[PDB]
Design a binder for this molecule. Sequence first.
Ligand SMILES: CC(C)CN(C[C@@H](O)[C@H](Cc1cc(F)cc(F)c1)NC(=O)O[C@@H]1C[C@H]2C[C@@H]3[C@@H](OC[C@@H]31)O2)S(=O)(=O)c1ccc2nc(NC3CC3)sc2c1
Ligand SMILES: [Cl-]
Ligand SMILES: [Cl-]
Ligand SMILES: [Cl-]
Ligand code: NA
Lengths: 99, 99
Amino acid sequence: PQITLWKRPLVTIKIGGQLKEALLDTGADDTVIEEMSLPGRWKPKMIGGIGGFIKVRQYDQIIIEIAGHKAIGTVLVGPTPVNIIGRNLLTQIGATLNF
Amino acid sequence: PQITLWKRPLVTIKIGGQLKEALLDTGADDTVIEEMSLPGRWKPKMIGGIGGFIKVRQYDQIIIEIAGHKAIGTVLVGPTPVNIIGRNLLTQIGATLNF
Ligand SMILES: CC(C)CN(C[C@@H](O)[C@H](Cc1cc(F)cc(F)c1)NC(=O)O[C@@H]1C[C@H]2C[C@@H]3[C@@H](OC[C@@H]31)O2)S(=O)(=O)c1ccc2nc(NC3CC3)sc2c1
Ligand SMILES: [Cl-]
Ligand SMILES: [Cl-]
Ligand SMILES: [Cl-]
Ligand code: NA
């Protein structure tokens, strides 16, 4: 699709068999999702945004569908205010910015 | 142009007579620039991101050149760690996300 930006670019994602809403975010290096259970081990990461830093759990090689496109990669889980799809997964679905 | 997302989508902007580097950020509703002076009236605002909120100054009707394309809109000025071009100005340069 071609998505204009007059509204937030929200899409449906599927992770762990569950549908969630998430923001396509070119300003995010990484994908960050609200608290949920994911399989396997995690590693620590601290990420910085506009109001300071949050600690998150880094899960690697997680299967996630984004707007009907399959991706497999790193998902950070933590107290993010919104679910964000960052460039690590936007590149896997072939997204570009165009003007 | 077509901007891929392998790296941060940074562009040059001109604002307030100054050249700056800023991130094209589909996850940002508003445009937020590091502390600088702008002419005219402003009012305070609180904006929230990862980590929490920061206080900014809201200036309306500010002209900004983004990668060579002129646009006018509201600009928020405050202690953001990155200059971000949000949707309020991305729309005006005709930017879309495509996949
Ligand atoms: C600020 C930019 C440089 C980074 N953010 C992405 C950004 O698009 C953010 C996404 C986002 C977070 C949030 F907590 C709430 C949101 F609604 C959206 N937007 C934002 O703060 O807009 C704010 C939203 C609200 C208030 C103002 C106005 O527009 C901009 C600002 O609307 S971030 O959410 O902090 C973010 C995401 C992943 C991420 N990955 C990282 N990886 C590590 C290696 C560096 S750092 C990092 C930071
Ligand atoms: Cl990844
Ligand atoms: Cl505006
Ligand atoms: Cl349009
Ligand atoms: Na003004």
